[PDB]
Design a protein around this ligand. Structure first.
Ligand SMILES: NC[C@@H]1O[C@H](O[C@H]2[C@@H](O)[C@H](O[C@@H]3[C@@H](O)[C@H](N)C[C@H](N)[C@H]3O[C@H]3O[C@H](CO)[C@@H](O)[C@H](O)[C@H]3N)O[C@@H]2CO)[C@H](N)[C@@H](O)[C@@H]1O
Ligand SMILES: [Mg+2]
Ligand SMILES: [Mg+2]
Ligand SMILES: [Mg+2]
Ligand SMILES: [Mg+2]
Ligand SMILES: [Mg+2]
Ligand SMILES: [Mg+2]
Ligand SMILES: [Mg+2]
Ligand SMILES: [Mg+2]
Ligand SMILES: [Mg+2]
Ligand SMILES: [Mg+2]
Ligand SMILES: [Mg+2]
Ligand SMILES: [Mg+2]
Ligand SMILES: [Mg+2]
Ligand SMILES: [Mg+2]
Ligand SMILES: [Mg+2]
Ligand SMILES: [Mg+2]
Ligand SMILES: [Mg+2]
Ligand SMILES: [Mg+2]
Ligand SMILES: [Mg+2]
Ligand SMILES: [Mg+2]
Ligand SMILES: [Mg+2]
Ligand SMILES: [Mg+2]
Ligand SMILES: [Mg+2]
Ligand SMILES: [Mg+2]
Ligand SMILES: [Mg+2]
Ligand SMILES: [Mg+2]
Ligand SMILES: [Mg+2]
Ligand SMILES: [Mg+2]
Ligand SMILES: [Mg+2]
Ligand SMILES: [Mg+2]
Ligand SMILES: [Mg+2]
Ligand SMILES: [Mg+2]
Ligand SMILES: [Mg+2]
Ligand SMILES: [Mg+2]
Ligand SMILES: [Mg+2]
Ligand SMILES: [Mg+2]
Ligand SMILES: [Mg+2]
Ligand SMILES: [Mg+2]
Ligand SMILES: [Mg+2]
Ligand SMILES: [Mg+2]
Ligand SMILES: [Mg+2]
Ligand SMILES: [Mg+2]
Ligand SMILES: [Mg+2]
Ligand SMILES: [Mg+2]
Ligand SMILES: [Mg+2]
Ligand SMILES: [Mg+2]
Ligand SMILES: [Mg+2]
Ligand SMILES: [Mg+2]
Ligand SMILES: [Mg+2]
Ligand SMILES: [Mg+2]
Ligand SMILES: [Mg+2]
Ligand SMILES: [Mg+2]
Ligand SMILES: [Mg+2]
Ligand SMILES: [Mg+2]
Ligand SMILES: [Mg+2]
Ligand SMILES: [Mg+2]
Ligand SMILES: [Mg+2]
Ligand SMILES: [Mg+2]
Ligand SMILES: [Mg+2]
Ligand SMILES: [Mg+2]
Ligand SMILES: [Mg+2]
Ligand SMILES: [Mg+2]
Ligand SMILES: [Mg+2]
Ligand SMILES: [Mg+2]
Ligand SMILES: [Mg+2]
Ligand SMILES: [Mg+2]
Ligand SMILES: [Mg+2]
Ligand SMILES: [Mg+2]
Ligand SMILES: [Mg+2]
Ligand SMILES: [Mg+2]
Ligand SMILES: [Mg+2]
Ligand SMILES: [Mg+2]
Ligand SMILES: [Mg+2]
Ligand SMILES: [Mg+2]
Ligand SMILES: [Mg+2]
Ligand SMILES: [Mg+2]
Ligand SMILES: [Mg+2]
Ligand SMILES: [Mg+2]
Ligand SMILES: [Mg+2]
Ligand SMILES: [Mg+2]
Ligand SMILES: [Mg+2]
Ligand SMILES: [Mg+2]
Ligand SMILES: [Mg+2]
Ligand SMILES: [Mg+2]
Ligand SMILES: [Mg+2]
Ligand SMILES: [Mg+2]
Ligand SMILES: [Mg+2]
Ligand SMILES: [Mg+2]
Ligand SMILES: [Mg+2]
Ligand SMILES: [Mg+2]
Ligand SMILES: [Mg+2]
Ligand SMILES: [Mg+2]
Ligand SMILES: [Mg+2]
Ligand SMILES: [Mg+2]
Ligand SMILES: [Mg+2]
Ligand SMILES: [Mg+2]
Ligand SMILES: [Mg+2]
Ligand SMILES: [Mg+2]
Ligand SMILES: [Mg+2]
Ligand SMILES: [Mg+2]
Ligand SMILES: [Mg+2]
Ligand SMILES: [Mg+2]
Ligand SMILES: [Mg+2]
Ligand SMILES: [Mg+2]
Ligand SMILES: [Mg+2]
Ligand SMILES: [Mg+2]
Ligand SMILES: [Mg+2]
Ligand SMILES: [Mg+2]
Ligand SMILES: [Mg+2]
Ligand SMILES: [Mg+2]
Ligand SMILES: [Mg+2]
Ligand SMILES: [Mg+2]
Ligand SMILES: [Mg+2]
Ligand SMILES: [Mg+2]
Ligand SMILES: [Mg+2]
Ligand SMILES: [Mg+2]
Ligand SMILES: [Mg+2]
Ligand SMILES: [Mg+2]
Ligand SMILES: [Mg+2]
Ligand SMILES: [Mg+2]
Ligand SMILES: [Mg+2]
Ligand SMILES: [Mg+2]
Ligand SMILES: [Mg+2]
Ligand SMILES: [Mg+2]
Ligand SMILES: [Mg+2]
Ligand SMILES: [Mg+2]
Ligand SMILES: [Mg+2]
Ligand SMILES: [Mg+2]
Ligand SMILES: [Mg+2]
Ligand SMILES: [Mg+2]
Ligand SMILES: [Mg+2]
Ligand SMILES: [Mg+2]
Ligand SMILES: [Mg+2]
Lengths: 272, 49
RNA sequence: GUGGGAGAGGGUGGUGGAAUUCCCGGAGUAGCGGUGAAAUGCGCAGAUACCGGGAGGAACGCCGAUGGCGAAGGCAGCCACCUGGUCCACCCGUGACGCUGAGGCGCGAAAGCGUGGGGAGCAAACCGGAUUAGAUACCCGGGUAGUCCACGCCCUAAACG
RNA sequence: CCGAGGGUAGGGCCCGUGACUGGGGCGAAGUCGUAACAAGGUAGCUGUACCGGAAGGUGCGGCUGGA
RNA sequence: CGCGGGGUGGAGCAGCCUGGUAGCUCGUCGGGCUCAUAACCCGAAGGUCGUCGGUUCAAAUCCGGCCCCCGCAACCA
RNA sequence: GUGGUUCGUGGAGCCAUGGGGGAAUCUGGGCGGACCACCGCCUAAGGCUAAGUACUCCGGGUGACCGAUAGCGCACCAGUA
RNA sequence: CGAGCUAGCCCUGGCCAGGGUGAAGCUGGGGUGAGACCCAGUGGAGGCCCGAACCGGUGGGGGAUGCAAACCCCUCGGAUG
RNA sequence: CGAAUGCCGGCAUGAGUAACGAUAAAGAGGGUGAGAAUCCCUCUCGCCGUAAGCCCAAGGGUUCCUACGCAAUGGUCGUCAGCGUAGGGUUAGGCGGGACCUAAGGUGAAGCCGAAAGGCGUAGCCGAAGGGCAGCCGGUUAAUAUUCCGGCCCUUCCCGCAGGUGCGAUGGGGGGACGCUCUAGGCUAGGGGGACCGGAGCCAUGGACGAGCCCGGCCAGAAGCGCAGGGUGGGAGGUAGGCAAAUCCGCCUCCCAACAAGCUCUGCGUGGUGGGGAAGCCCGUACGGGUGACAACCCCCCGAAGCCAGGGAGCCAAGAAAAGCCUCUAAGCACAACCUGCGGGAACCCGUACCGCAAACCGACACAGGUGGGCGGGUGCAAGAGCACUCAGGCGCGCGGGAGAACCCUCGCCAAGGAACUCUGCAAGUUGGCCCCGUAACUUCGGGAGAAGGGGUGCUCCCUGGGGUGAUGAGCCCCGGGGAGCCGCAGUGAACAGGCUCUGGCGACUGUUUACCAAAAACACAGCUCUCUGCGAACUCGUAAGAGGAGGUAUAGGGAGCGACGCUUGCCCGGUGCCGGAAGGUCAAGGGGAGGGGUGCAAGCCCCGAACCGAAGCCCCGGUGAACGGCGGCCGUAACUAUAACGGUCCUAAGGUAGCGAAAUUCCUUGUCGGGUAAGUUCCGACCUGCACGAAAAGCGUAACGACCGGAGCGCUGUCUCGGCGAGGGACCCGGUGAAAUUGAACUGGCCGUGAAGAUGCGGCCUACCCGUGGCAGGACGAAAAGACCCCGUGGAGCUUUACUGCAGC
RNA sequence: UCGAUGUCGGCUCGUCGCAUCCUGGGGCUGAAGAAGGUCCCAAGGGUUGGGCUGUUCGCCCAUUAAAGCGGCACGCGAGCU
């Protein structure tokens, strides 16, 4: 839906906030299962190695369930859907009859009170997790494992999915959010449905501060700098570059393919 | 204005203390040099309890 | 009211085959495309034509009519749901409850616009190749917006009987 | 107190005038090309969209006021 | 003032660097087609190569000096 | 592929070795400056071994060494203020 | 050897007088087939406004062997981010 | 040694000169003393009072208190001191920190890596103004006090008795546990008033013996109460999860509650008792002591930002951890152990003085600078921590006395004119708070807005409407209305408090920046687009291990550019880049050996060595511009001239579209028209001949916004005509202390000449007794910095690239 | 003169030259008069305010007896901007 504001201030006239109506009466989270201390820090042991990180709201990590094959066969009741500061998506709090409480990343269409479960069994319904094999060709799916028993790694961003395209002996072909065509092992779990919160892309930050709230420090142009700092630094009053556009570290930034050629992963990929 | 000396006992101790110098080869040599020199004070005297 | 009937009338969800284009495998060569005639273009780096597989979008051949439906615009593969209009028969109920309609309000082809998706074919602009005195056209080889979908605008027409 | 009028400030409508600009009408025999009327030598017209010295051309849907 | 590029039939341009031969498109002129003009077709004409010198057997062509033309430069103060 | 030696790729041996290949036990093996023949010299891939040699924190001796701006930074409670 | 100054980030704390303006959303009324929407009243949003603390450092003057190796005076920017 | 802007030391000059450190301010009497403006005391005066007053923390480290001192330290003096000598002073189970806990980060057994040194590292450990944890009020010292003492009250341990129970962990669960804005109810701190209570006293100078003036009317406090408020459901089954096990927790399912009824838990009142208790007067202090006193200790009102507290509501950016504590069981042990009550005993270590917005901290100084947290009274002005005055409390800033010139600083006023000043209204004025009328273009519908422009503002009396606290009233406190009237030049009478408008450029906007000459139109910014990246991601850092990215996964991450929003962003892929091409050419080691060479009597041993087989790269074939970039010349033509829709021709990869244009771009240039003016190189509008705009190094616009920059007008003025006067701090004179750069020596005039070309010093002439004080700046090519421009040196550094040569990386 | 001779303009303050702008005296005039022209003498005094531009200079506006030209380190920054 997206919340919109009137221009009672500049920067309030474009600003735009998510709709939280799917956030069920459960705004503060769940101890026990999560949260952990989350360790803010824009850099490695010592030095900054990703520029322009820092500031922005304190967070608690929700330790979510990315391998659903523990509770094969054990169903769970979806108890709530809550805000997760550390991902684009929303998260489902679910209660297993087992007693155990996990969070699943919350797919589009998930309703509270719903039944959900994981395993070879598993009715093909939104929320359920299955090894890729038993899932019908053509159904859209998410939180897909890359290699079996290694955890969900594909399609967890808000409003993303992959679609099952066909099969090939032990592998089923996937079409990933990027549009790539991937052979992913049959035995990999993946949960049916799309991610949801799909209006995430429609949000307009609206002002500088908002950027900072999310811990995004000001990014400065190479043009703004000096020859010591950047290939684009200097010279006089503005300058068009004077070389093929580059990163600060000298590599070209328009076109230069960067995936290494001899990756053994290659023989499992069929697209862009 | 604000000058450059902003005394802090803890800082002076953690920074220039006998135990800091002892911790690394760089520092151990400092004690060696100061000893051979005949320095009355190997490290700065940080006070208080 | 009761009981019936035809229909591409509307909206949503799902689905089927033919064809084109691109990709992959096989087989296969010296030309294919195209036109008034050509050239541009594509092709021994293996094109065209032929067989197998896969992908994707869009439009539904025959039935089809000089036919049907709607208030117009408009509506056509098939299926299910939701839904409007309407004709007949019986003459059962109400009982003049009617007709029209400034304004208002809704709907309103195509092109266009916003946001996002999609993109096979086609195709403004644009680039080439021929034609001409010239060609910013007509023909030909490419080609992007758009053409498709969702939501929001736009309100025009030879919106014509 | 009110009160003609005078004064200060800010608006509304109207008329005049203005470098320069936009298209319009009119003015016997200047230029360019041929769009329309015959199937007008590309059927025409059309709402719209883009392009072009110019008439105009092309895309899309429409009309018969053409076959 | 300095620099380097250029003046060739009526128009716009080739011809030079490796000196002997001035070519193209248009235009002009004569002839056709047409009722006529243009288009088109068949013929033909037209250039002291900016000027002064010499270099060579021979100069548009190579080397000097003036003459207009274009282009660049003129910075530190 | 490099280092060592006077040797800087040189006709470049010798001595060490990171990489690849990879033997033999005296009729076995290395060397005498590419290499080959001859004539010779040595016996690699385990280890230890006084003395003669270096220095001067410390003690002593001596000076065609200084004599308080000299001589050690310091003759003096100086690596101090 | 230095981040006890300065720059950024990390962890844990603190501070921001008093005034203005009045968004959404609620509630009532209106409107409609249901809506949209429109009036109020309520509400109390914002890199919103005036202005101390606080953070600055705009213009002018002074100062110039200074009170000060960047200061003083009047003036001025921000002040729930 | 005579020179090195030489080195060390010593002493001159400037010179009794500049200064003596905030313009908050002093005067007198009396002490003391060898000696007093400067020390003590008293009286008067002034300054601070969201401090210039109190309390913490850091830092400092004896500066504390006292006795005796004044050589030096003190910008003067000093009898004084933060200085010299000595002596004394810092008392804790409850305050802070440690025998408690975890944060970032550190360290780091396991493990991983690294020539060495060392680098990483889930467990643990360390690490704190954050979690935890038991003391309040008074009194005493010259100097400590939540530490001593008094009263009242608590905490752990250890050992007993007495009563309870399956007790029991570093293991399970629960809790601890958390944002920002706004907030309700009830309290407390604190404050105002009182005809009431308590007090020495006091009637002055015209009046007042009065419900007069003045001063004060509290603090702490266990249990039990009372009032507010915070936390919490109770059963019974079933159970497969909480990494062993649980009765606990979790998840089901039935009952009864749904209330805070009940349990607890805090706060606040009250409380046995304990303590404090003014002005004034009298004393001797360097200060405290006594009396007031058997002190009184009561009633209203305002009331927090603090307390109940984990309260409530809203919002998106979604808000530590661990222990203590509750609970559940495990091994064990159930004569143990643990819980409750009561007794007795035990209770360590380090800090404690003083300064603490400053003369004791950071700035070489008793330095107009910098320094975190809490209290911070009253009155008035709408409010407030603002401003004026002033409680408590603390100060008059460690040179003074005169004078009353120039000039400077800071300040006040000014006839007439009013921007004529000037690069510029620079500066200075005008305006200024609050209530009420009233407000335009334009606009993204919010705004523009405090638009503009106006009016009101004191005091007195009369009438009158709402609340709040009390009971539905009096009072006490907040907000209103109406009507008469009074005084002055003037009523936010003092202080604090916008000058306004029109029109351009740039940048959308709040932000950011060259600490110490630039705050901007530069950076940033939401947003747009291109490109890389399928996850052990790309990229970054690191030799490595490893880490960031990210406990993220294409709606995500990195890189580049543009830079809100509107309308848009043309043509060129020839060169360079990047992308795509199992063909071809070239292409290194390696393979391969036709063939040849050297030695051997030979078997042999050792050399070179052509075919051919050999990657990436380059070549070559394509693509791609929100990739690097680029986007023409010359002639002719219309029935007045003029101009050229129209044509010719050359060349290119293509030959700049729209929009804009004498511009933050225009040389010629003050282009030419128009506008503002008496007059306009600037400004605004146009034209286009664009030296040398033009589309994401974006193009053209845009409301709002700005300590930006330009042009104009109103208002107002000492900016100016053109100055004048007054004020205070200096300047001047006197007493006290007393610097500096500079300096070859000096017995240091003018002119015209001359000289290395600008002479006090040389020539000629002219002038001129010796020495100071206040002033002025023409000169000593005055001082200051071994010119920062310029060149030179086969000097140096930062930067760049299709310079050379390497290296990392790929 | 580079071990420094501050560099345009303005402002303040002057002073000097004369090849004189005005005022005084004068000759020739194609000088009727008035007013001019032009040459000689003469520096004693005077030689305005504004718009524009950093400007010097210039161009304007309104005046005037006139709206002079040059030098003094393009006079003058230990005098200012
Ligand atoms: N009245 C005509 C209107 O204007 C236009 O027409 C104008 C022009 O097109 C037209 O120009 C014509 C030209 O077309 C034609 N080929 C040649 C002719 N000499 C011109 O003529 C013009 O100029 C001449 C001389 O000055 C006059 O005498 C004459 O009146 C005038 N029409 O002159 C017209 C004005 O007079 C539109 N084409 C027409 O549709 C419109 O309705
Ligand atoms: Mg936890
Ligand atoms: Mg590192
Ligand atoms: Mg470290
Ligand atoms: Mg940026
Ligand atoms: Mg820069
Ligand atoms: Mg660089
Ligand atoms: Mg430039
Ligand atoms: Mg550059
Ligand atoms: Mg009937
Ligand atoms: Mg009708
Ligand atoms: Mg329509
Ligand atoms: Mg359409
Ligand atoms: Mg968008
Ligand atoms: Mg096509
Ligand atoms: Mg076509
Ligand atoms: Mg033709
Ligand atoms: Mg019809
Ligand atoms: Mg008009
Ligand atoms: Mg007109
Ligand atoms: Mg036609
Ligand atoms: Mg025609
Ligand atoms: Mg036609
Ligand atoms: Mg059309
Ligand atoms: Mg066309
Ligand atoms: Mg220079
Ligand atoms: Mg060597
Ligand atoms: Mg050998
Ligand atoms: Mg040998
Ligand atoms: Mg030997
Ligand atoms: Mg030995
Ligand atoms: Mg001697
Ligand atoms: Mg000595
Ligand atoms: Mg001696
Ligand atoms: Mg010495
Ligand atoms: Mg409202
Ligand atoms: Mg507000
Ligand atoms: Mg604000
Ligand atoms: Mg403010
Ligand atoms: Mg000498
Ligand atoms: Mg000396
Ligand atoms: Mg003197
Ligand atoms: Mg003096
Ligand atoms: Mg003096
Ligand atoms: Mg003083
Ligand atoms: Mg006062
Ligand atoms: Mg002492
Ligand atoms: Mg003392
Ligand atoms: Mg004494
Ligand atoms: Mg003294
Ligand atoms: Mg002093
Ligand atoms: Mg004495
Ligand atoms: Mg003392
Ligand atoms: Mg102990
Ligand atoms: Mg500890
Ligand atoms: Mg610990
Ligand atoms: Mg370590
Ligand atoms: Mg660790
Ligand atoms: Mg602690
Ligand atoms: Mg404690
Ligand atoms: Mg004390
Ligand atoms: Mg138990
Ligand atoms: Mg436990
Ligand atoms: Mg626990
Ligand atoms: Mg009396
Ligand atoms: Mg009490
Ligand atoms: Mg268990
Ligand atoms: Mg007393
Ligand atoms: Mg709460
Ligand atoms: Mg622990
Ligand atoms: Mg103490
Ligand atoms: Mg104390
Ligand atoms: Mg303080
Ligand atoms: Mg002092
Ligand atoms: Mg001070
Ligand atoms: Mg401060
Ligand atoms: Mg207060
Ligand atoms: Mg006020
Ligand atoms: Mg104040
Ligand atoms: Mg005046
Ligand atoms: Mg006056
Ligand atoms: Mg006036
Ligand atoms: Mg002026
Ligand atoms: Mg002037
Ligand atoms: Mg101005
Ligand atoms: Mg001003
Ligand atoms: Mg302006
Ligand atoms: Mg502006
Ligand atoms: Mg800005
Ligand atoms: Mg700053
Ligand atoms: Mg600066
Ligand atoms: Mg600024
Ligand atoms: Mg500044
Ligand atoms: Mg990692
Ligand atoms: Mg991570
Ligand atoms: Mg990106
Ligand atoms: Mg920009
Ligand atoms: Mg930019
Ligand atoms: Mg472009
Ligand atoms: Mg190109
Ligand atoms: Mg190409
Ligand atoms: Mg290319
Ligand atoms: Mg390639
Ligand atoms: Mg190759
Ligand atoms: Mg122009
Ligand atoms: Mg230009
Ligand atoms: Mg004019
Ligand atoms: Mg003009
Ligand atoms: Mg530009
Ligand atoms: Mg561009
Ligand atoms: Mg821009
Ligand atoms: Mg700003
Ligand atoms: Mg004055
Ligand atoms: Mg005075
Ligand atoms: Mg004196
Ligand atoms: Mg000297
Ligand atoms: Mg001379
Ligand atoms: Mg002499
Ligand atoms: Mg002389
Ligand atoms: Mg002088
Ligand atoms: Mg020099
Ligand atoms: Mg050289
Ligand atoms: Mg010089
Ligand atoms: Mg000198
Ligand atoms: Mg000098
Ligand atoms: Mg004369
Ligand atoms: Mg005369
Ligand atoms: Mg003016
Ligand atoms: Mg003069
Ligand atoms: Mg000159
Ligand atoms: Mg000049
Ligand atoms: Mg000068
Ligand atoms: Mg100066
Ligand atoms: Mg001077």
């Amino acid at each position: 839906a997206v919340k919109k504001f009137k221009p009672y201030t500049p920067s309030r006239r474009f600003m735009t906030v998510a709709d939280f109506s799917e956030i069920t009466k459960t705004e503060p989270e769940k101890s026990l299962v999560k949260p952990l201390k989350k360790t803010g820090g824009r850099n490695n042991q010592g030095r900054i190695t990703v520029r322009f990180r820092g500031g922005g709201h304190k967070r608690l990590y929700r330790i979510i369930d990315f391998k659903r094959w523990d509770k094969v066969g054990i169903p769970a009741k979806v108890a709530a859907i809550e805000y997760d500061p550390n991902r684009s998506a929303r998260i489902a709090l679910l209660h297993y009859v087992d007693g155990e409480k996990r969070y699943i990343i919350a797919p589009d269409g998930l309703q509270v009170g719903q039944q959900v479960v994981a395993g070879p069994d598993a009715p093909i319904q939104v929320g359920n997790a299955l090894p890729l094999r038993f899932i019908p060709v053509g159904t859209v799916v998410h939180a897909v494992e890359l290699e079996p028993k290694k955890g969900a790694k594909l399609a967890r961003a808000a409003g993303t999915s992959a679609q099952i395209q066909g099969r090939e002996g032990d592998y089923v072909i996937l079409r990933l959010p990027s549009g790539e065509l991937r052979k992913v092992h049959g035995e990999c779990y993946a949960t049916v449905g799309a991610v949801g919160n799909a209006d995430h892309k429609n949000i307009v930050l609206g002002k500088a501060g908002r950027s900072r709230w999310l811990g995004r420090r000001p990014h400065v142009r190479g043009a703004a700098m000096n020859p010591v700092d950047h290939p684009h630094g200097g010279g006089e009053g503005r300058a068009p570059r004077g070389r093929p556009p580059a990163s600060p570290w000298g590599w070209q930034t328009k076109g230069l393919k960067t995936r290494k050629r001899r990756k053994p992963s290659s023989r499992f990929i069929i697209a862009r | 204005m604000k000058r450059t000396w902003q005394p802090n006992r803890r800082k002076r101790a953690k920074t220039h203390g006998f135990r800091a110098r002892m911790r690394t080869p760089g520092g151990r040599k400092v004690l060696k040099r100061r000893r051979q020199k005949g320095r009355w004070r190997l490290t700065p005297a940080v006070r208080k309890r």
